[PDB]
Amino acid sequence: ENLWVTVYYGVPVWKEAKTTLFCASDANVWATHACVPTDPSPQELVLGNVTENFNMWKNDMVDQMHEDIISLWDQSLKPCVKLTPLCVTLICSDATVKTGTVEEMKNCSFNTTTEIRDKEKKEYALFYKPDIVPLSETNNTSEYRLINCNTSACTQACPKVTFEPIPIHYCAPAGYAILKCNDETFNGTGPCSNVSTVQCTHGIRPVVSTQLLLNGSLAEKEIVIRSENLTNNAKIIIVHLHTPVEIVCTRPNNNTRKSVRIGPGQTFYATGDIIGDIKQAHCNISEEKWNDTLQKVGIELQKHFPNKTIKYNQSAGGDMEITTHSFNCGGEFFYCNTSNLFNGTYNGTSTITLQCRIKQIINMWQGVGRCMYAPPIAGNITCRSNITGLLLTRDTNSNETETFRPAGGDMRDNWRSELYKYKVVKIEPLGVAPTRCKRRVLGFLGAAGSTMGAASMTLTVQARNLLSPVWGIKQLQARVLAVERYLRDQQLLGIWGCSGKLICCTNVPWNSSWSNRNLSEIWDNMTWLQWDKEISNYTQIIYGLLEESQNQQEKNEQDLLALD
Amino acid sequence: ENLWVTVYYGVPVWKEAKTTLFCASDANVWATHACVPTDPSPQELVLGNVTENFNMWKNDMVDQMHEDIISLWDQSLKPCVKLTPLCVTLICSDATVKTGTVEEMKNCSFNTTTEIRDKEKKEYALFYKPDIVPLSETNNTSEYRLINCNTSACTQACPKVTFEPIPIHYCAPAGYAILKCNDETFNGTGPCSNVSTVQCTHGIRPVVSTQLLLNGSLAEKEIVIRSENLTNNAKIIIVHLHTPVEIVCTRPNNNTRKSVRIGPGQTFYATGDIIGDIKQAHCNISEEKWNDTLQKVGIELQKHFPNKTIKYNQSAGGDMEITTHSFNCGGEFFYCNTSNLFNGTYNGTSTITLQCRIKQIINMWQGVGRCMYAPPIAGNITCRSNITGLLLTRDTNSNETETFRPAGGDMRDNWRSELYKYKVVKIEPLGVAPTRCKRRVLGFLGAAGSTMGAASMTLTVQARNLLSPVWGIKQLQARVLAVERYLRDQQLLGIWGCSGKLICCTNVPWNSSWSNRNLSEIWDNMTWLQWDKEISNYTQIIYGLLEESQNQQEKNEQDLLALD
Amino acid sequence: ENLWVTVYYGVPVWKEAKTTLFCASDANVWATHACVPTDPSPQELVLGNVTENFNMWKNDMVDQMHEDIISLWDQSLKPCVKLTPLCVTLICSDATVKTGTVEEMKNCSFNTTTEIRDKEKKEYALFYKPDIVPLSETNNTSEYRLINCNTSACTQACPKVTFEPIPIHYCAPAGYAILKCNDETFNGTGPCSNVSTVQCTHGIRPVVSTQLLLNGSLAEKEIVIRSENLTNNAKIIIVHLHTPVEIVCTRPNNNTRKSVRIGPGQTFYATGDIIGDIKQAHCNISEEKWNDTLQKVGIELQKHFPNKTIKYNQSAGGDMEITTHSFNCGGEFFYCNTSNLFNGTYNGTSTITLQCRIKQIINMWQGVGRCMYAPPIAGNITCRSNITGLLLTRDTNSNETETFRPAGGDMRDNWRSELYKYKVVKIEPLGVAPTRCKRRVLGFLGAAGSTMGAASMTLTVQARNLLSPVWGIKQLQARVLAVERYLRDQQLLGIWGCSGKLICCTNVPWNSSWSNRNLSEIWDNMTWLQWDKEISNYTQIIYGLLEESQNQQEKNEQDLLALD
Ligand SMILES: *[C@@H]1O[C@H](CO)[C@@H](O[C@@H]2O[C@H](CO)[C@@H](O)[C@H](O)[C@H]2NC(C)=O)[C@H](O)[C@H]1NC(C)=O
Ligand SMILES: *[C@@H]1O[C@H](CO)[C@@H](O[C@@H]2O[C@H](CO)[C@@H](O)[C@H](O)[C@H]2NC(C)=O)[C@H](O)[C@H]1NC(C)=O
Ligand SMILES: *[C@@H]1O[C@H](CO)[C@@H](O[C@@H]2O[C@H](CO)[C@@H](O)[C@H](O)[C@H]2NC(C)=O)[C@H](O)[C@H]1NC(C)=O
Ligand SMILES: *[C@@H]1O[C@H](CO)[C@@H](O[C@@H]2O[C@H](CO)[C@@H](O)[C@H](O)[C@H]2NC(C)=O)[C@H](O)[C@H]1NC(C)=O
Ligand SMILES: *[C@@H]1O[C@H](CO)[C@@H](O[C@@H]2O[C@H](CO)[C@@H](O)[C@H](O)[C@H]2NC(C)=O)[C@H](O)[C@H]1NC(C)=O
Ligand SMILES: *[C@@H]1O[C@H](CO)[C@@H](O[C@@H]2O[C@H](CO)[C@@H](O)[C@H](O)[C@H]2NC(C)=O)[C@H](O)[C@H]1NC(C)=O
Ligand SMILES: *[C@@H]1O[C@H](CO)[C@@H](O[C@@H]2O[C@H](CO)[C@@H](O)[C@H](O)[C@H]2NC(C)=O)[C@H](O)[C@H]1NC(C)=O
Ligand SMILES: *[C@@H]1O[C@H](CO)[C@@H](O[C@@H]2O[C@H](CO)[C@@H](O)[C@H](O)[C@H]2NC(C)=O)[C@H](O)[C@H]1NC(C)=O
Ligand SMILES: *[C@@H]1O[C@H](CO)[C@@H](O)[C@H](O)[C@H]1NC(C)=O
Ligand SMILES: *[C@@H]1O[C@H](CO)[C@@H](O)[C@H](O)[C@H]1NC(C)=O
Ligand SMILES: *[C@@H]1O[C@H](CO)[C@@H](O)[C@H](O)[C@H]1NC(C)=O
Ligand SMILES: *[C@@H]1O[C@H](CO)[C@@H](O)[C@H](O)[C@H]1NC(C)=O
Ligand SMILES: *[C@@H]1O[C@H](CO)[C@@H](O)[C@H](O)[C@H]1NC(C)=O
Ligand SMILES: *[C@@H]1O[C@H](CO)[C@@H](O)[C@H](O)[C@H]1NC(C)=O
Ligand SMILES: *[C@@H]1O[C@H](CO)[C@@H](O)[C@H](O)[C@H]1NC(C)=O
Ligand SMILES: *[C@@H]1O[C@H](CO)[C@@H](O)[C@H](O)[C@H]1NC(C)=O
Ligand SMILES: *[C@@H]1O[C@H](CO)[C@@H](O)[C@H](O)[C@H]1NC(C)=O
């Protein structure tokens, strides 16, 4: 009996939101403009009893990271040489070392501009066949063109830059938090238990590949299979492996590099000669460990189609960029044929080798970015990588069999695989509750699942952490919004007569039309975000009573001071 | 007797200022780069008894909007193709369809670059005569040049962009307001009554035209005639109409469009062939409604030159861009001859047709911006528009007659015609007043014309609204200044011992050397901005007394606490 | 006995820091983009008894100013014409007027592009010999090239821009200050007395020269000799003069200027013809005033090598940019030979003339910036300048003699010479001290060397001044950090129960484990920054006691209000 409303600040309570996360680096493109070096030391905290719903296929971190990478790794071409003076009538013949012919390359000859513009030099380069296009149908002829020269002018990548994926961390600006699921076999969506808060993510490697996920974070106890709706054939399946399989890939033949003058100051790097022995670019996977993996995926894949047998087949065919395994290695771009790898059947109970083609002229993502020329790297090249996961699609011609095929290249699905466990939220530090009072007239959100009385002992902790080119403007935009939110909070607390105090008591009587729970049933038996959810719809009524009450009270005081 | 100073916060009082307004859009160039989509719902409030002076010919909104439009609609050319490879020796002959010769166009032939640089293609386009210049005086010859190729390299407008005027709203940042005159026949300057405040303007269409104002907001009850000083012949007269007259304009002949290759990726759009019948580009106005309008302007124009007769004549002659009616329609640029329209006399008590020329190479405003090539639009084109107003100038050769002529093209005068009714002001929420107290030891400005005691009941309303490329930077710079102003306010209230409270009372005695009015004569019979105007010169004395008093008081308290 | 901790705000105390100072201008490149016009009126204040250590060879103002100048005066080339169409096979012969041959210049002829691209014009210019390079070794021949056309494409400086050094002021953002040494013969490093604070520096002229410092601020009473370590031969010596010597320099021959068409809109300015008489570019210094200066430097230079004789010799030889006196005059760039000037010996007790070469193609600083073409200025040119100081280096071949030579061109050393007297600091307005109290339950830093009790009478002064492309972003970044620092201060004062008050008293008892000094020995006999230095290591203990105490106190009050 005789309840009145009280206002609290620094309540551990939150709402679902979207806002620009800042890029954080340990200790090249990322750590030289978009990402601040900031050595984010691990600072996780477990939340005792909270439950949240998480959803991989709506997490705005993936679409933020896609825009961040696309923008950054288009902007990193801006200082470098345009190959516009190289769109020249290109005359070509078969490439040959004294040791043999190379079928993957042509030998081409052209005219180039010097820093003395009025003279032109006859010059030659070897080019990989998939970047050269024939210039007329009229006769079988030696005359060719660079493939980009009907669509875009390409930029060479400056040889100081390197594409090796550095680990990237994402972090919350002040007044926001990241929540993380620890639960085994989370299935990418639905109700989760054992949540933690972390001020930043673990390292996400910005690795780009089309059918096999290379160097990703491993699965924790058993194979996890994820998609929006397994019944719908139009949705990608992400498969996340527990025990790795290791892929070794190489260009086995030694290429020499030459520099061509191409006007004032600018220079073009191209393949000059091949040193000795010749063999095609290739990769190996250990056949038994692949078989075991393909089987162990199989028995988890069966549980969603229980009575049907399952079998694996080639990708959809056509253009290399979808029907093949793409990746970057040493700075060269490899495309490999996977027909040997995805070939088998399952119902119960040596090395395989892949062969590849190399390209230099590449369209980085889905026609959104500039055409890049990848400059050649000298000598032999090798990469070691871990296959962490598979991207699959499911085809009826049959009732007893399901048929699965490699697919990918909506680049978001690679970054979704590292970000399945994460959610972004906004802290809302104000709240109101009933109490028996009259006015006289351990970490960022740490308590959040607890009894409301316990959280009232730690209010200061959620109070302090409220305050602290695109890459510049978004930091200033984030910081100013964080300041403006804090000032609105303190201004309401001024207008209600609390005037900078964390727990505050007021003459507005509680109304049973809002809630009827006992004082102990509120204070001992409920957790703050549940109380907030219940009072939510009435909340905008309460603030009007507080403002008029303070205005009445100040007029009564201002009157009395003339007679006191 | 026994008055002391009191400090108030959220007083409805203001000063005249300039500060960059933010561009707002309903729901192409404006709403996709400079202007935020923000669907500004109408939120006007009338002010009861305030009077202000307004002045059209010094309103810094017009010069802000001019810079905003010039900057934006120069920046919208930045991504598009440069026609530098088109400055070529251009060889030309008369244009002819089997149906006849076209006198407005030449047929020109030239050499163009392909994405294969080492070959050149012979190619042709039709060009409108006013964009082509003859290349030597030596003989009457077929050799010509594009007009821009001695001054600037032109950029084509990208065909995704469209020039149709979307309505633009201007809004006040926090701590500022817009005031509006409702008064009929305001005459553009002087003392106004019935003012309103509005958080944003109505829609201003950014329409560009040189002699007749198209699609502007109409006059409310009778024809309004505006200028700085009607006696001075050197000043433009704006005339604002009550009942519209409707203009229909067309290109009646069907033009086919062709795309020319112009190096890698880039393409040029030009007129290829004309389909059939040929007739000159023309406009119509209904002759009786024009006559009635020209007469009804006449009887209001007489009242400033009472005894003299008035007559209308051609523009000043010379170059098309001043001596003709320019406008844009469907994306083509029309220039029309107005000699038929401004021809008549007045002393008391069918369609007219105009004929036109089309240009593609245009200098958008007074040599300030890039040269734009307007790409041709296929088929026949028509526009319907309302003539809202006239721009005039007055020529002595006579005593009985005044002679009036069309003039314009200082682009500000079109935007002045939509912004005549508006003023920008800064809220100054602090103030001091006398009271009988000792210290113990409905909308954004809504009340502003009222008795001071009444405004003291609504102080919170003026308190809350104090807080909330160039297009990015100017919003951060506006927001940070709004935060810094608020913090200075709260810091003074700290230094004076009010420490976050809206009405505050102090031991500094009022001094008759500042003012001598009775307590009721202050509090009942005056309005806040008048009291502020009166106390203005003394105000900087008062703040020194407040600061030293608080410092004395705190030392006295800090002493006593050792003995309390 | 019975001491308790008290918190103060606006304490005059500071720490050593770096933060980006803002450029300010009196009343062209500086005052039109990087530098605000703000006519910064002199506002120095002397500090009574403070001492600080200053160090010229670690002052981050010099490295900030270097980055500011390099960035600005590279960015000022961005709008102007690229000379890429001028890298042409250039055919040349000896230059001759009817009056004679000029040995410093060639006459060169070339082909240029018109705004009509398909025609080329035969055209000629005179060029200064040091900017032209011979194109093949095969024979002694008339064929040449512009020197930049193997490294960079140069930009012409737009003739509206001017390089005359305007005085630049550097100023502190809110929450920072600049401190200044007034002491005579400061020796560039170590403990200083008679310090002042000033909100901005005096005018620093951004003058660039390589061996003699022109137009710098003079020495105040006697010659000052400065370096990190005079024993180390690898360190530059700065010598700062008391009485000036005046240098007059000229190009005595009249050059006519011609404008060449170089594609659409763009134009190139070059030397056309020489009017009449011919004589080499030269400078004069008065021989007796130089001798006296070189001697008077000598007797101060002896005091660091007491028994040795001292003698002066030529610079190191090789490339002009280090081995010669560079400067800019009227917009031309002069390089002069100093062998006549630095030639003499000292042990105890007419005009000299220098001859020069002119260049147009210049690399502004150490290969960091673009290559600039300096356009020719018409007519004869003269400059008057004051030699303010010398840059020297010391070479063993001997025991009785020290040998000194001109050196420079690490551009920082010119700006170090104007900034030797300055230091940047951060105000830290919080502090804690002991007092006998229980809780009931003249300028920017002006006092800073005084007794702590006296500073407590002026706390408000240090309180108010806490609050108020790269050139835009750095001002927003600075302002937002200044706001965020202030909000953190006020938030701690909230969490400790002071809630916006300048002197505040608390129930936390003082602990002898921190300090043991008498109450008067603290309050009367010590100055705030010394007390701050002493309490420094314990300080982070104190804030934990304050936060838990306030939380205890608020819970005790919130309990009692139910029973009051
Ligand atoms: C690619 O083509 C070039 C041009 O024909 C080859 O270079 C020539 O090689 C022969 C070898 O006997 C020499 O005699 C010529 O003097 C070379 N010409 C030049 C311009 O250097 C080159 O060997 C070919 N490379 C491959 C791998 O096919
Ligand atoms: C998941 O996919 C299934 C189909 O794969 C959706 O259910 C229906 O399936 C039948 C048979 O293919 C169709 O005729 C219906 O049109 C489908 N309904 C819809 C709305 O598509 C099912 O809806 C999907 N799940 C969700 C959450 O929409
Ligand atoms: C003063 O201006 C107000 C607008 O603030 C006018 O209000 C309009 O009045 C008419 C009837 O006369 C209504 O139909 C409108 O809906 C009103 N509102 C608006 C926004 O137009 C008012 O008439 C004016 N009064 C005087 C005496 O000038
Ligand atoms: C503009 O000039 C071009 C070039 O002369 C004309 O195109 C030619 O038209 C004749 C019609 O008999 C054809 O025989 C030629 O083969 C065309 N030449 C090309 C290159 O296509 C064009 O018809 C002229 N158009 C107008 C409207 O004058
Ligand atoms: C408005 O214009 C008139 C003239 O049109 C200005 O008054 C004077 O007019 C006579 C006769 O033309 C001139 O000899 C004077 O030199 C004019 N005076 C000035 C100061 O120009 C009148 O001043 C103008 N109004 C204002 C506000 O200046
Ligand atoms: C300490 O430095 C101050 C400057 O802060 C010196 O003040 C100058 O003193 C002379 C007379 O000696 C005056 O003419 C100047 O006007 C003073 N002000 C300035 C800005 O120069 C002061 O002399 C120094 N005192 C000592 C003992 O070093
Ligand atoms: C630089 O060279 C040009 C080109 O030879 C000289 O210009 C010629 O001067 C003679 C003087 O008798 C004239 O007959 C020619 O008609 C000029 N040619 C042109 C293209 O104008 C120029 O005089 C030389 N200048 C110097 C100072 O050496
Ligand atoms: C200042 O320079 C001197 C040498 O010019 C440094 O002292 C030592 O000098 C001897 C003889 O040249 C060398 O063998 C030593 O190696 C020098 N020591 C070092 C650490 O370089 C002296 O150290 C320099 N001053 C400072 C502050 O380092
Ligand atoms: C797991 O994934 C499947 C995909 O078809 C989905 O239908 C299901 O709702 C998810 N959650 C659980 C708890 O099974
Ligand atoms: C390899 O795995 C596939 C897929 O289950 C299976 O068809 C095949 O029999 C396995 N073993 C061998 C030796 O290929
Ligand atoms: C309590 O709530 C009801 C329903 O909203 C309302 O009618 C009543 O006025 C409220 N009580 C008070 C004291 O206003
Ligand atoms: C109206 O406009 C005329 C223009 O000549 C001006 O002189 C006058 O001051 C304005 N105001 C009034 C109330 O007439
Ligand atoms: C049209 O208006 C003008 C201007 O007053 C007048 O001279 C003319 O007589 C009017 N009537 C006709 C039929 O032109
Ligand atoms: C009142 O005003 C006069 C004139 O400014 C001044 O001399 C006097 O000191 C003021 N009164 C007090 C109490 O200071
Ligand atoms: C003065 O400069 C010399 C340079 O060798 C340096 O060693 C010395 O420490 C400086 N300071 C003093 C007070 O001499
Ligand atoms: C000039 O100064 C130098 C340096 O001390 C000295 O050698 C010479 O004797 C002086 N006098 C003359 C006349 O050169
Ligand atoms: C005083 O300081 C000592 C040493 O840090 C500490 O053990 C003691 O607990 C402190 N006193 C109080 C009252 O906490």
What are phi and psi for residue C159, nearest 5 degrees?
-60, -10
Instruction: For ligand 11, pick from A513, A539, A552 the residue to mutate: most ligand atoms within 8 Å of CB.
Output: A513
Q: What is the position in ligand 6's atom list of the atom closest to the CA of C180? A: 5
Burial (CB < 10 A; 0-12, 13-18, 19+), residue A390, is buried
- Output the CA A100–ligand 1 centroid distance in Å: 14
Q: For residue A32, which amino acid is it?
A: T
Q: For residue B393, which amino acid is it?
A: T
Please tell me the distance from the alpha carbon of residue A323 to that of residue A338, in angstroms, as a whole number.
9
Chain C touched by A1 (CB under 8 Å)? no
How far does the CA of residue A559 sit from the closest CA of chain B (Å)? Answer: 8
**Residue C285 and residue C291 in contact, taking contact as beta carbons nearer than 8 Å:** no
Please tell me the distance from the alpha carbon of residue B372 to that of residue B86, in angstroms, as a whole number.
14
Query: What three-state secondary structure class fits B151?
Result: coil
Whether B436 sits inside 8 A of A562 (CB atoms) is yes
Please tell me the distance from the alpha carbon of residue B93 to that of residue B108, in angstroms, as a whole number.
7
Q: For residue C113, give every residue at least 6 positions away whose Cβ sits within 8 Å of its Cβ, in sequence order, or none.
A: C85, C120, C261, C262, C263
DSSP 8-state code for residue B31:
I
| Chain centre to alpha carbon of residue B561 | 63
**Residue B439 and residue A557 in contact, taking contact as beta carbons nearer than 8 Å:** no
Instruction: Record the tokens describing residue C178, joined without a space.
Output: 């600049």
DSSP 8-state code for residue B305:
S
Burial (CB < 10 A; 0-12, 13-18, 19+), residue A229, is exposed
Whether C118 sits inside 8 A of B88 (CB atoms) is yes
Please tell me the distance from the alpha carbon of residue B308 to that of residue B314, in angstroms, as a whole number.
20
Q: Which single residue is written with the structure tokens 């007083």?
A: B11
Q: How many CB atoms lie within 10 A of CB C112?
A: 16
Q: For residue A113, which amino acid is it?
A: T
Instruction: For ligand 7, pick from C104, C107, C111, C144 the residue to mutate: most ligand atoms within 8 Å of CB.
Output: C107
Whether A116 sits inside 8 A of C491 (CB atoms) is no
Burial (CB < 10 A; 0-12, 13-18, 19+), residue B148, is buried
Q: Which of C190, C172, C183 is nearest to C52 (CA)?
A: C190
How was this structure determined? It was done by cryo-EM
Task: Compute the count of residue pairs across chains B and C with CB atoms less than 8 Å apart.
Answer: 82
- Output the CA A225–ligand 9 centroid distance in Å: 10
Exposure on the CB side of residue C371, measured as CA atoms within 13 A: 18
Chain C touched by B563 (CB under 8 Å)? no
Name the A residues in 208-267 with CB < 8 Å from any C CB.
263-265
Burial (CB < 10 A; 0-12, 13-18, 19+), residue B409, is middle
Breaks (C-N over 2.5 A) in chain B follow: 27, 349, 395, 441, 468
- Whether C232 lines ligand 8, by a CB cut-off of 6 Å, is yes
**Residue B78 and residue B154 in contact, taking contact as beta carbons nearer than 8 Å:** no
Chain C touched by A118 (CB under 8 Å)? yes
Query: What three-state secondary structure class fits A550?
Result: helix
Please tell me the distance from the alpha carbon of residue B208 to that of residue B206, in angstroms, as a whole number.
7
Query: What three-state secondary structure class fits B299?
Result: helix
Whether A151 sits inside 8 A of B265 (CB atoms) is yes
Q: For residue B233, which amino acid is it?
A: N
Resolution reading in Å: 3.7
In chain A, residues with a C-beta closer than 8 Å to the C-beta of C495 are 460, 463-464, 502
Q: Which single residue is written with the structure tokens 């000033």?
A: C198
Which string of DSSP letters, residue by residue, matches A32-90? Answer: GTTSEE-------EE-SS--EEEEGGG-HHHHHHHHHHHHHHHHTTTTSPB-GGG-S-E
Instruction: Record the tokens describing residue B411, joined without a space.
Output: 């682009």
DSSP strands (E only) in C1-99: 4-9, 14-16, 22-25, 36-37, 45-46, 52-55, 90-97
**Residue C115 and residue B149 in contact, taking contact as beta carbons nearer than 8 Å:** yes
How far does the CA of residue B336 sit from the closest CA of chain C (Å)? Answer: 30
Helix residue ranges per DSSP H, B354-428? 412-418
In chain C, residues with a C-beta closer than 8 Å to the C-beta of B477 are 472, 476
Please tell me the distance from the alpha carbon of residue C72 to that of residue C160, in angstroms, as a whole number.
16
Burial (CB < 10 A; 0-12, 13-18, 19+), residue A373, is buried
- Output the CA B30–ligand 16 centroid distance in Å: 74
Query: What three-state secondary structure class fits C249?
Result: strand
Which string of DSSP letters, residue by residue, matches B174-194? Answer: TTEEEEEE--TT-TTEEEE-S
Which string of DSSP letters, residue by residue, matches B356-377? Answer: EEEESEEE-STTTSPEEE-PPP
How far does the CA of residue A127 sit from the closest CA of chain B (Å)? Answer: 17
How far does the CA of residue B332 sit from the closest CA of chain C (Å)? Answer: 25
In chain A, residues with a C-beta closer than 8 Å to the C-beta of B469 are none
In chain B, residues with a C-beta closer than 8 Å to the C-beta of C483 are 480, 483-484, 487
Helix residue ranges per DSSP H, B403-469? 412-418, 452-455, 459-464
| Chain centre to alpha carbon of residue B93 | 44
- Output the CA B194–ligand 3 centroid distance in Å: 9
What are phi and psi for residue C432, nearest 5 degrees?
-125, 145
**Residue A221 and residue A334 in contact, taking contact as beta carbons nearer than 8 Å:** no
Burial (CB < 10 A; 0-12, 13-18, 19+), residue C253, is buried
Q: Which of B523, B281, B452 is nearest to B381 (CA)?
A: B281
Maximum pairwise Cα distance, chain B: 113
Whose atoms come closest to the Cα of A346: which ligand? Answer: 10
Q: What's the Cα-to-Cα distance from A245 to each of A297, A335, B52, B560, C364, rounded to whole Å?
A: 13, 19, 80, 79, 56
Which string of DSSP letters, residue by residue, matches A131-161? Answer: GEEES-SSSS-SEEEEGGGGT---EEPPTT-
Q: What's the Cα-to-Cα distance from C544 to each of A78, A307, A357, C496, rounded to whole Å?
A: 51, 64, 64, 10
| B48-51: Cβ within 8 A, 24+ apart | B48/B449, B48/B450, B49/B449, B49/B450, B49/B527, B50/B195, B50/B448, B50/B449, B50/B527, B50/B529, B51/B191, B51/B192, B51/B193, B51/B195
Chains near C, with 3+ CB pairs < 8 A? A, B
Q: How many CB atoms lie within 10 A of CB B181?
A: 18
Q: What's the Cα-to-Cα distance from B488 to each of A500, B491, B554, C463, rounded to whole Å?
A: 17, 5, 21, 11
Ligand 13 pocket by Cβ (under 6 Å): B 291, 294-295, 298, 344-346
Q: For residue A233, which amino acid is it?
A: N
Query: What three-state secondary structure class fits B540?
Result: helix
Q: Which of C433, C462, C450, C461 is nearest to C532 (CA)?
A: C433
Please tell me the distance from the alpha carbon of residue C458 to that of residue B61, in angstroms, as a whole number.
44
DSSP strands (E only) in B415-522: 422-427, 430-435, 503-509
Q: Which single residue is written with the structure tokens 């500039």?
A: A370
Look at phi and psi of residue A498 and say left if phi exceeds 0, alpha if psi is from -120 to 50, else beta: alpha
What are phi and psi for residue B116, nearest 5 degrees?
-85, 95
Q: What's the Cα-to-Cα distance from C8 to each of A94, C16, C18, C489, C528, rounded to whole Å?
A: 84, 21, 25, 11, 11
Whether B547 sits inside 8 A of C460 (CB atoms) is yes
Exposure on the CB side of residue A183, measured as CA atoms within 13 A: 22
- Please state whether beta strands C45-46 and C195-198 pair in parallel, antiparallel, or not at all (unpaired): antiparallel
**Helix and strand totals (H; E) in chain A:** 10, 33
Which string of DSSP letters, residue by residue, matches A169-185? Answer: EEEPPTTEEEEEE--TT
| Chain centre to alpha carbon of residue C243 | 23
**Residue B5 and residue B436 in contact, taking contact as beta carbons nearer than 8 Å:** no
- Please state whether beta strands C325-329 and C332-336 pair in parallel, antiparallel, or not at all (unpaired): antiparallel
Instruction: Record the tokens describing residue A501, joined without a space.
Output: 């105090």
Helical (H) or strand (E) element with A463: helix A459-464
Instruction: For ligand 12, pick from B230, B231, B236, B300 the residue to mutate: most ligand atoms within 8 Å of CB.
Output: B230
Q: Which residue of B83, B87, B370 to mutate against C (max C Cβ within 10 Å)?
A: B87
Angle at A222 between CA A218 and CA A224, to 5 degrees: 75
Q: Which of B265, B262, B267 is nearest to B114 (CA)?
A: B262
Q: How many CB atoms lie within 10 A of CB C494?
A: 20
